[PDB]
Symmetry: D2
Subunit: 494 residues, 4 copies
């Protein structure tokens, strides 16, 4: 069932959100926000800069002070507020999915059934953890009583990408708030709108002021201000590996703030000759084409054993030739645009390198349409390991298919990258499934599927795809700071 | 009981340790190693540089390969090797304590009864964790079987300081090896000797070659090579906050390697009027003077309620006037030298700032002796919060004593620093002990004691005193990399 | 704020609840249900017996089968259903609190503000755990992949007491359902009504049929049928220690079903001479008098240091002389009746033993009123350790106050019982608070408070006060059954 | 390599062990101890009875008192003593393996390479846990500080079986001592000798007196005394399900002591048509024949898909026809005797029922030899589900092989028992391996192997095969008692 908004979407929230009130930019400047499917301007939004990040950090710092409502309320009540926020997003699901689709160039069907559902589910997951964050009592040597407090870290700067604006907003603020932190959020310049609507719901739910502050603006300005701020305790960033290196450097340069990074990938699939071929073709297809290829986990190197390689390529090409391009709000449309011009150019450039460097073009290979940043879905076969399309993250609807004959060699090829976000193994052999997944240097390894991500799982990269993990039990560790308290006593007993 | 070595100490191990064999420096260069209590040269050691770190990373990488002995042996056997290494250090305790004291300027009594005991105990603690590192099975949404592997990260560069060369060597390699990593260790330029002897014992114990590689040399050369290396997965550094910022920046600049930092402090004590005064005087005294003040946790700001301030100052001064300076090997000597000239100059300079800026000099305040980097134990009273001796880490035998009258104000003063390693609270009030320890922004808070550190406790800093934790259950997390494995199944059941 | 039901309470749900439908008793027999404050009959309820427990076990067994909706739905959805049930109880809070007060003889103010709030909060706590129940991956010796599943146990029989019918219903079904079990609940013969209303809400919330089955009836009949049933996997019982022994024996005799027991107590308080005297008097007063003394944790032995004993006794007596007895529905009433005649007789008998055995009667000591099972609030001083009122659980509004002079001796006296549910320590001394709480053989020890119980804490007895724990992280273990799965593989890697 | 004792074994330790000293029985009576391979008497041992269990409980109680050496020593030192005990057993491995083989009728090769190795490894595993047993700090509702202590329970009675006397002794005392308990051990009447030698090593290692007390004697006398004792806090029993029911009943009848039970089984294997047939034949063969079939996990129902059934039966029969019966000390001997006459008679009786009830006798079926309790290794094919040999635990070298054609049906057959200790699944299908292991009601499920047990894994039964788990992280829970400590504070902060 796909319900829709019956009235025209109205844009209301366009300002900076600090202390639960709406602020104009200190400068007074605004910046435009566009629809990627028509290239038209949707509205203007206050452009946050350093001076505005500064106001937001002071509010988050004040809300984090010992004795404050956010520090003294029951953990169970932090969880209650998060579950109420999820309820409010459920109530506004139609308008949120519409705004996300319109602003993000995201198929409305997916925005409604996947993004919004994942936002609600992840918030509810995080809410349940709030009063279950616990320290230890420890049998230290000597006559002492030792316990630990897993405290919130403090003020957390959180820089959100444009490919999944709502899901990634919730993946950031959910755990941070559950653990008792306060946050300064910087949504992507391309997609500030849905985060500002959620800010309106954070007010409605009753979060104390300054617990969540949202500062739209640009990366090199507001994002850099966060990463270099001397009173931000931790920065979490999701985006390119190139910016991730800059975030980590600025943290070292300023105040040694803690850093979590969720970065790009060049994630491989290994399809053994004994695999369920149709199952592997479909999971690897969606694994690389999902959201116009704009997933960091994109299955952008697909290695197929020689004896099924040609059959795999044909079936992949047939699947890719079935899309309907156009406005992601129209029912039946199955591929929307890329997010903006910068990404669009890099995709087309990489596609050209595939042609020149000798990859076999099976379908697609060019732009589409009169308006919008549309790229034809493209499949390359006979890709080799030193081609650009095999080394660089494309972030577009561009599939690479490679042949292998030796299992030892293909694992080394799969691992021969600086990336390491995810991988897939397709086989019917129990031993191969366990040993290959163990040997891949990747944060998530899927067996006989791809792209399966849920709130209960930790998620993050090996190597240059990331530092740290998000979600699951394990992800919640990086939103606490562990304090050891050791008390002298006359005599301990076990 | 204080047994001693009956024969003259002989220095044997002076070379670089890679793949369980002894290497000359690629350059062929050596550097001198001195005794800080006499300023004489003890021996020469091969000077590792980038080319030597390079050989060590390739050995650690090869030892980490899937299928290798270190990757395939039982976790219980990793633990067995660590317990055997502890046995071997116990066997060589006399010579190790002598070498540590001679090279490190460290009171032999402490070297034998505390450093060596802590090395043995921490190794035995870490050994017990090896086959108890576990992942999860997770009830993910949908028809999937999801488990996690807490794998070793890989090759870990570990830069060891000179104030506790053996303890910090073991605090680094213990957890790293227990979790299955391989390491490239860089001991301090001042104190390479005891780490090279332990390397000889790692060979004897039977660790596979390349699991532990030790490259003596200088910070700006070998240490920088580690921090910027493109095939080191994680760097752990203990030392100054200034170098810590450089380590973190170089990690961001190169390969986004994971970073753990244990840095300096300006740790405060708060002594309430109802405290056991003698107990507070003695714990705070040793808290700041231990190992000639060369502890990152040094209790270098001591705040005393006005009505007991003068009594606290007198009793502190009497305790400080009781030391016997000289060679740390002679029995009855109770204060050895500072480690080297650089540290010695910074201490004397800061002591001079105390005189000029108006602190009340109660005892000490100058150098001592014909030879050795000796500083008189010094006490300053009437210290105020913007003096240099109240803001900068001294790392010398220099005690600061301050008065307070308001508890709200003194907590803000205690927290008004970029440091945050530790703190102490001295009181008989149950509520004050809990609420004050909760409000201090410090990684370890001691109640009615100070400086109590043990293998069972996590240990690390808030703010610019550190990133991450070492030891305890929680410290072992930062030597694993979490992989999620998600398997498609026909139907799951709870 | 104390809102009330504006309309007369109507009783609707009076039948056995199996497979989400209402059943008459197999026999066709019903039993009466009374109001303890007027001794009048409120209604009749179907009397479940063995044949009815049998129907309920078969339904719970079928609902637990592999492939069933309850076994295959996402853990997150089990949690969702529990949070919806909490929402429904919130909606029906007025009628539930009224029915609980009317049926249970429970002060309406407490029923509304404490019992109902605790029901809602505990359900919400348990809901959060559902998709956070996890097993392990384990580095077993040899070439194997080993993981564990923390499965639900299966069909759990749950026998609920009459002193807190709703809270204890939720403390049982919350964790059991969160972990994926199915249940057969047997509410107290005295108080079946609120559990049957909740059953109506379990239907409304959408739990699959047979996941929760509720069989009202008598202990020796339906309760014994559960404890001896050959296809019930686990029994949880809260009630007297005498019945607890019978439950455990019948489990051994039949099918070795798992057993959790939450039983009575004779819990002690130790009030040191340095205690906040008013704080100790008030917490110990409510600790023994709460809900007409009908708490298993009742603070029924209060030991006071000699020098403050007389002052403690006077202040206690003044507090006890302030109650207003009567119908627990009338505002301003502060003490309702005992639950029934059996309990009423045992209370009066024990009160008489206090008079005869030489206790000093300070106030109360007899019955009250024309109707209802009312007991005057009673205080005994000069109680000695071999009196009946110091050894046997009274479960009535009867306070015992004892003198001590030696701390070693009073701890031995506190521990000299077969019970061990809880205890309290009142002191301003940090060391005494830690060492005394460590030395008491009791499941919960309160320091400078009493009776503080919350969903985040494990709760249960030492010794003959109980087996196992309920709630908290730790309580959830006893609603899982751990399965180890060990898979042969060609070669493992860490 | 199989080294042997060069000198005749001398029996020295034959008395009751209490408070680290050797006691004669209160009665003065002794009982004989036999060799099962020759039926000759090896020595006499003091016969412990109730009066002797009484002396042992008082010693264990005194050793558990608050302030005692065992209660106050560092947890790390409890671990140290356990690692030293493992060292001492390693030193005495030859004599211990000889005594175990001689007393137990156990193949010396297995006694040396498996039993003794498992004793040493399990002790070392348990030692590592000692200072890693931790409670929690908990964010309770309201202004309170709440922590938990995972205390030792207290005095634990431990009844050890005769099939693995040393391994099961260590599986019991290892975790109990690691957690800080004191124990009263009752080795099997048939095999007291190796436990008394270990007691001598517990003295040598330096355990405080009364921490371990060992009372040889008979089940209905000393074992019943333990199970009914009013001052034993917990009983752990391994043995038959029939005695397990009596242990659990006596616990309920006396003092509600905690109970852990490791009982028998009728564990099934399911061999799918796609299995590695040779691998399944060998693992299932050893799974049922190990230690003359005297394992509770014996794979005593083997279900094989029809199309490979005949091939499976032939290959099994060939493997069973390869044993050499005789004295388990002689090299090359591969099957020793059953433990005693009672077990020997039950085995032969059940074998006769197989003949009469219509099972196809493939080999064996009778006794062997002039002396010793020897049974020919026996294989039955065409076994059906209501035969005695398919329902009752045989505990002898008797293999049952069954045919199945329907997977749904064979899982129901596998689960159609009151037992539930373990099971095996043999297949090459990933989905079948996961779904079948999930659906089996068994505590350990092996995939493509059988009988793989190690210290890092929890181990125990579903249903009437057991209550609770031993070893692993999870097994250590049942040797602690959780105490919640809740402290009133003026204001909490997260
Ligand atoms: C949020 S909760 O669900 O955890 N729980 C909180 C506690 N509850 C109260 O109503 C309550 C309130 N005030 C008190 C004041 C003094 C006192 F001694 C007790 C109380 C109790 C109380 C405490 C323990 C019990 C048990 C026993 N035996 C475990 C049944 C029963 C009632 C029920 C709701
Ligand atoms: C390291 S350990 O301490 O964990 N443990 C490893 C297993 N042990 C073996 O000797 C062993 C060896 N080989 C086998 C081969 C096939 C087989 F079916 C069983 C075995 C067993 C084995 C397995 C289970 C049991 C129990 C039962 N019932 C739990 C008592 C007893 C013996 C003892 C030492
Ligand atoms: Cl911790
Ligand atoms: Cl995990
Ligand atoms: Cl587990
Ligand atoms: Cl706990």
């Amino acid at each position: 069932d796909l319900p829709v908004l019956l009235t025209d979407l109205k844009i209301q929230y366009t300002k900076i959100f600090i202390n639960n009130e709406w602020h104009d930019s200190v400068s007074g400047k605004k910046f435009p926000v566009f629809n990627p499917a028509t290239e038209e301007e949707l509205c203007q939004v206050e452009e946050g800069d350093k001076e505005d990040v500064d106001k937001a950090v002071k509010a988050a710092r004040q809300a984090f002070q010992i004795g404050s409502p956010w520090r003294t309320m029951d953990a169970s009540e932090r969880g209650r507020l998060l579950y109420k926020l999820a309820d409010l997003i459920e109530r506004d699901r139609l308008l949120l999915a519409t705004m996300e689709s319109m602003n993000g160039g995201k198929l409305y069907s997916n925005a409604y059934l996947n993004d919004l559902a994942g936002c609600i589910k992840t918030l509810r997951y995080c809410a349940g953890w709030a009063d279950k964050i616990q320290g230890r009592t420890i049998p230290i040597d000597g006559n002492f009583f030792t316990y630990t407090r897993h405290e919130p870290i403090g003020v957390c700067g959180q820089i959100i990408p444009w490919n999944f604006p709502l899901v990634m907003l919730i993946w950031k603020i959910g755990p941070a708030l559950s653990c008792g932190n306060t946050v300064v959020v910087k949504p992507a310049e391309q997609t500030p709108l849905t985060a500002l609507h959620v800010a309106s719901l954070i007010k409605e739910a009753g979060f104390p002021p300054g617990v969540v502050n949202i500062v739209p603006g640009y990366g090199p300005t507001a994002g850099a201000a966060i990463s270099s701020h001397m009173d931000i305790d931790k920065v979490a960033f999701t985006g390119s590996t190139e910016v991730g290196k800059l975030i980590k450097e600025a943290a070292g340069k300023s105040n040694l703030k803690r850093v979590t990074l969720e970065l790009g990938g060049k994630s491989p699939c290994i399809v053994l000759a004994d695999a369920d071929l149709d199952n592997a073709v479909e999971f690897a297809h969606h694994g690389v084409f999902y959201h116009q290829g704009q997933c960091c986990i994109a299955a952008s190197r697909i290695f197929v054993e020689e004896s099924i390689y040609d059959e795999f390529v044909r079936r992949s090409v047939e699947r890719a030739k079935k899309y309907i391009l156009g406005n992601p709000l129209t029912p039946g449309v199955t591929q929307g645009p890329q997010i903006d011009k910068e990404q669009y150019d890099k995709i087309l450039d990489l596609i050209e390198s595939g042609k020149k460097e000798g990859a076999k073009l099976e379908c697609g290979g060019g732009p589409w349409g009169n308006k919008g940043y549309f790229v034809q879905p493209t499949v390359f076969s006979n890709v080799t390991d030193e081609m650009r399309i095999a080394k660089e993250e494309i972030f577009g609807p561009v599939q690479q298919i490679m042949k292998f004959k030796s299992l030892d060699d293909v694992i080394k090829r799969a691992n021969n990258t600086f990336y390491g976000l995810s991988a897939g193994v397709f086989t019917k052999d129990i031993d191969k499934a366990i040993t290959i997944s163990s040997a891949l240097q990747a944060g998530t390894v899927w067996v006989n599927c791809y792209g399966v991500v849920s709130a209960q799982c930790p998620f993050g990269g090996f190597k240059m795809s990331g530092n740290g993990r998000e979600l699951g039990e394990y992800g919640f560790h990086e939103y606490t700071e562990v304090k050891t308290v050791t008390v002298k006593i006359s005599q301990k007993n076990s």
